[PDB]
C-alpha cells in the first residue's frame, strides 16, 4: 500500500509526542506515558484508500537548526502543532516554523493543529494566563492564523481525551494523497 510520510512540528508546549503516542496506541497511556517517540507506520483506510502512514516527531530537535532539517526529506504532510493554553506558541507559527517548513518543503500541505482544546474550560489555565495579560486561544484565532499562513486546513483536538485525534490523522492522509 502507498506509503506517505508525516512530520509534526511546533514548540514542546503543544504536546507533539503526546498526540503521536495517543494516536499510534489508540488509547490514552494508562500506566506510563513515554518520554520519547521513535517512528511508526499506521495503516489507515480513508475514503476507501489503503495508505501506510509513517509518523515522525521533531521533539528534541528544537535547538538544533542544522540537525532538524534532516527530518524533512520526502515529507508528504506537515502537522503544524500549537497549544490552546499557550498563545506564545501560536506567535511562533508565522515567524519561526512556517518560514522553515516552506523553505525545505514549499508545496507540502500544512495542517495547523490546535492541541489541548480541553484546557479552554480548565480554570487553572485561565487563571495562569490572566497573570500574563492573556487567555486561551479562541477558535477564531487558530482559524485566522491558518488562513494567514496559507495552511491546507485548521484542526483542533485534545491529546488528553483523544477527542479529534483520529480526525486529524485521517485529514493528514487526505492532504498527503493529493
Amino acid at each position: 500500500a502507498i506509503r506517505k510520510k508525516l512530520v509534526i512540528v511546533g514548540d514542546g508546549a503543544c504536546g507533539k509526542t503526546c498526540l503521536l503516542i495517543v494516536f499510534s496506541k489508540d488509547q490514552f497511556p494508562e500506566v506510563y506515558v513515554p518520554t520519547v517517540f521513535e517512528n511508526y507506520v499506521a495503516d489507515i483506510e480513508v475514503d476507501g484508500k489503503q495508505v501506510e502512514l509513517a509518523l515522525w516527531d521533531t521533539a528534541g530537535q528544537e535547538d538544533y537548526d542544522r540537525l532538524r532539517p534532516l527530518s524533512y526529506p520526502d515529507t508528504d504532510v506537515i502537522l503544524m502543532c500549537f497549544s490552546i493554553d499557550s498563545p506564545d506558541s501560536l506567535e511562533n507559527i508565522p515567524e519561526k516554523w512556517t518560514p522553515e517548513v516552506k523553505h525545505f518543503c514549499p508545496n507540502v500541505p500544512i495542517i495547523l493543529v490546535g492541541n489541548k482544546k480541553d484546557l479552554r474550560n480548565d480554570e487553572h489555565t485561565r487563571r495562569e494566563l490572566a497573570k500574563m495579560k492573556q487567555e486561551p486561544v479562541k477558535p477564531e484565532e487558530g482559524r485566522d492564523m491558518a488562513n494567514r499562513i496559507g495552511a491546507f486546513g485548521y484542526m483542533e483536538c485534545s491529546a488528553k481525551t483523544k477527542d479529534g485525534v483520529r480526525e486529524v490523522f485521517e485529514m493528514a492522509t487526505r492532504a498527503a494523497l493529493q
Binding site: V31, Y32, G60, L67, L70
Partner: protein, 234 residues
C-alpha cells in the same frame, strides 16, 4: 536481537516489567524515576537493533547477493560499523548495570540507584569525541545516502528486488533503508529529553542529581558540537 534482552524489555514500562508484588514495596517517585531509566535502556536496545539491521541485513546483504561496489554501499550506510560499536558498547554497560541491580533469585526485579556515572563516562572523554566525530560524519552523509538509495531503487531491478525481499518481514515495516537512516539521526536528540525526565525524579541522593546534571550538560554540549560540524553533501 538476543531473545533474553528482548524479553527483559518487552514490557511497556518498568512498573509492568517487574513483579507486581515487588512493585508494591516501592515509592511512587522511585517507580517514576525507574520507568524513565527503563525507557532509556529500552530505546537504546531498539537503537542497537536498528543499527544491526543496517549492517547485517542491508549492508552485508548488498555485498553478498547484489555483488555491488563497496563504495556505493559505503555511501548508502556510512559509518554504521563505527556507530554500531559505539552504541552496542553503551547498551552492554546499561544492560550490566541492570543485571547488578537484580534481586537475588529473580531475573525481572531490579532498581537502578546509580545511572549518572555511567552516562558521564559515555558522554565525556574519547567516547564522546568518537560520538561527535562519527555523528558529524553521519549527518553530513545522511542527505547523500537518501539520494543514493532512491537512484538505485528506481534504476536497477536487482536492488529493487533485494529491497522488497529483505524488507518483507513484518518487523521491518518501520525499518526500511530510509527510515533506519532517520531513526539514527534522531537518536542523539532523544538523550537530553530522557536524562531530563530521570533527573526530575532523582533528588533523593545529591551526588546522583549532580551526576545526571553533568551528564545532561555533556549531552547538550555533544549535540551543540555535532550540529555545528554538519555540512550537507550531494
Amino acid at each position: 536481537s538476543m531473545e533474553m534482552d528482548e524479553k527483559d524489555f518487552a514490557a511497556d514500562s518498568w512498573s509492568l516489567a517487574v513483579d507486581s508484588s515487588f512493585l508494591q514495596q516501592h515509592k511512587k517517585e522511585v517507580m517514576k524515576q525507574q520507568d524513565v531509566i527503563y525507557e532509556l535502556i529500552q530505546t537504546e536496545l531498539h537503537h542497537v537493533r536498528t543499527l544491526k539491521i543496517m549492517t547485517r541485513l542491508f549492508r552485508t546483504g548488498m555485498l553478498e547477493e547484489l555483488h555491488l561496489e563497496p563504495g556505493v554501499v559505503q555511501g548508502l550506510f556510512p559509518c554504521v560499523d563505527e556507530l554500531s560499536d559505539i552504541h552496542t558498547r553503551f547498551l552492554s554497560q546499561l544492560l550490566e548495570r541492570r543485571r547488578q541491580a537484580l534481586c537475588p533469585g529473580s531475573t525481572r526485579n531490579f532498581v537502578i540507584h546509580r545511572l549518572g556515572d555511567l552516562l558521564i563516562s559515555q558522554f565525556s572523554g574519547p567516547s564522546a569525541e568518537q560520538m561527535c566525530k562519527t555523528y558529524s560524519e553521519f549527518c553530513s552523509r545522511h542527505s547523500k545516502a537518501l539520494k543514493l538509495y532512491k537512484e538505485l531503487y528506481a534504476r536497477d531491478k536487482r536492488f529493487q528486488q533485494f529491497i522488497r525481499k529483505v524488507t518483507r518481514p513484518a518487523v521491518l515495516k518501520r525499518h526500511g533503508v530510509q527510515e533506519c537512516i532517520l531513526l539514527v539521526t534522531q537518536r542523539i536528540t532523544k538523550y537530553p529529553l530522557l536524562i531530563s525526565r530521570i533527573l526530575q525524579h532523582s533528588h533523593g541522593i545529591e551526588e546522583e542529581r549532580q551526576d545526571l546534571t553533568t551528564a545532561l550538560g555533556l549531552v547538550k554540549e555533544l549535540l551543540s558540537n555535532v550540529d555545528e560540524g554538519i555540512y550537507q553533501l550531494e
